[PDB]
């Protein structure tokens, strides 16, 4: 099984990249029970630039063809208690995202769940032994609510909703 992301327009097969990290936003307020919630980033291009882990490809939510980590995935933030400060994730094993050309890009479901569990484990280090929950983007302009990226004189908009819908105890 794979995870399908609807894109617009249809990215050609040569726009397939490697997910080398992502950018997150922690949901605030009085949390309930044993859960901490994370979504795609609610910031602008400032939050993506603060990472300095991306390559030549401009991209939101997911970093494509960027910098990998040495051994394990590693996360940074200016302030872990400020939810207005985004959480930068740098993977150690890149996830292949391959587009068919008919409007759907695909991602291995098992390898994505594999990296999400590594992310959730590293997030429990910064917020205690809690349940990690990933949820879709809260909203924003089409450039930031979708996984947007440029590829050879183009700019695509891919809904990343199916990527953020898991729970980790």
């Amino acid at each position, epitope marked *: 099984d794979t995870i399908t992301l609807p894109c617009r327009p249809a990215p050609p097969p040569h726009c397939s990249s490697n997910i080398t990290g992502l950018i997150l*936003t*922690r*949901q*605030g*307020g*009085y*949390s*309930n029970a044993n859960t901490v*919630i994370f*979504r795609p*980033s*609610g*910031g*602008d*291009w*400032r939050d993506i630039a603060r990472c300095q882990i991306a390559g030549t490809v401009v991209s939101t939510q997911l970093f494509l063809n960027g910098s990998l980590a040495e051994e394990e995935v590693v996360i940074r933030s*200016e*302030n872990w*208690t*400020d*939810n*207005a400060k985004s959480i930068c994730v740098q993977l150690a094993t890149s996830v292949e995202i391959a587009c068919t050309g008919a409007g759907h890009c695909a991602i291995s479901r098992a390898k994505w769940a594999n990296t999400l569990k590594q992310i959730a484990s590293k997030l429990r280090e910064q917020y205690g032994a809690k349940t990690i929950i990933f949820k879709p*983007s*809260s*909203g*924003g*302009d089409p*450039e*930031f*609510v979708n996984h947007s990226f440029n590829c050879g004189g183009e700019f695509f908009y891919c809904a990343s909703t199916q990527l953020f819908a898991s729970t980790w105890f």
Partner: antibody, heavy 121, light 103 residues
Framework: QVQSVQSGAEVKKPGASVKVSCKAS????????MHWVRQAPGQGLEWVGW????????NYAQKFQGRVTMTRDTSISTAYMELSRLRSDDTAVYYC??????????????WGQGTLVTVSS | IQMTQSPSSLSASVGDRVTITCQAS??????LNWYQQKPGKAPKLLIY???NLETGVPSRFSGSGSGTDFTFTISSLQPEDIATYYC?????FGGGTKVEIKR
């Protein structure tokens, strides 16, 4: 005088929705996050969420996750909050406030005058 | 974060030394803000980062503390200082302390 002006007081039936405006007078949004804080008639302050004016991204409190929506209009420097499926518990004064995007902490400044929203059938 | 601000209310005469305490349950370092809300108006920032004073606020207002215990003090109460005071740290506010007049 630089200040944040809000829309007038509103009354809504239970189950309806209310949209509150917060217009920037004398400044623009590009350097700040806009936060919304509500206060029930005799209660304390409760944070609802913030919005990024450059991207439209938001981060609502988990209490209002499914029912609140924040937007902004950059051409007129006005932030909006619309609360859906209103209930009697939502009767409160809703404030908007400015928080610097580049700041290390949250320093609520330039509050609006407040907007009284009453839920009643 | 749990914000315990005590007392809930207090009464003092004109000229007495008012002291309001806000204690958090977790180590928040020196960052803690104090707001003053007069009835019918919006909150107004008086003290930021526990001890620093926002521009335009009279010198009678002061604050101290670090870690988890913080105090907010009014050296000489004035007829324009009767209000409800809140401690704030990120999205979490204290319960509030209303200042009343003693007779």
């Amino acid at each position: 005088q630089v200040q944040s002006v809000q829309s007038g007081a509103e009354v809504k039936k239970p189950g309806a929705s209310v949209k509150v405006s917060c217009k920037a007078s004398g400044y623009t949004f590009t350097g700040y996050y806009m936060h919304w804080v509500r206060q029930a008639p005799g209660q304390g302050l409760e944070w609802v969420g913030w919005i990024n004016p450059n991207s439209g991204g938001t981060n609502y409190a988990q209490k209002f996750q499914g029912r609140v929506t924040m937007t902004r209009d950059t051409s007129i420097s006005t932030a909006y909050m619309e609360l859906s499926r209103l209930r009697s518990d939502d009767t409160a004064v809703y404030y908007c406030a400015r928080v610097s995007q580049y700041s290390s902490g949250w320093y609520f400044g330039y509050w609006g005058q407040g907007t009284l929203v009453t839920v009643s059938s | 974060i749990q914000m315990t601000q005590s007392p809930s209310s207090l009464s003092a005469s004109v000229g007495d030394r008012v002291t309001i305490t806000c204690q958090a349950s977790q180590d928040i370092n020196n960052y803690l803000n104090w707001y003053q809300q007069k009835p019918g108006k919006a909150p107004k920032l008086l003290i930021y980062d526990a001890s620093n004073l926002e521009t335009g606020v009279p010198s009678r207002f002061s604050g101290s503390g670090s870690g988890t215990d913080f105090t907010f003090t009014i050296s000489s109460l004035q007829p324009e200082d009767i209000a409800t005071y809140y401690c704030q740290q990120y999205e979490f506010f204290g319960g509030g302390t209303k200042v009343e007049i003693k007779r």
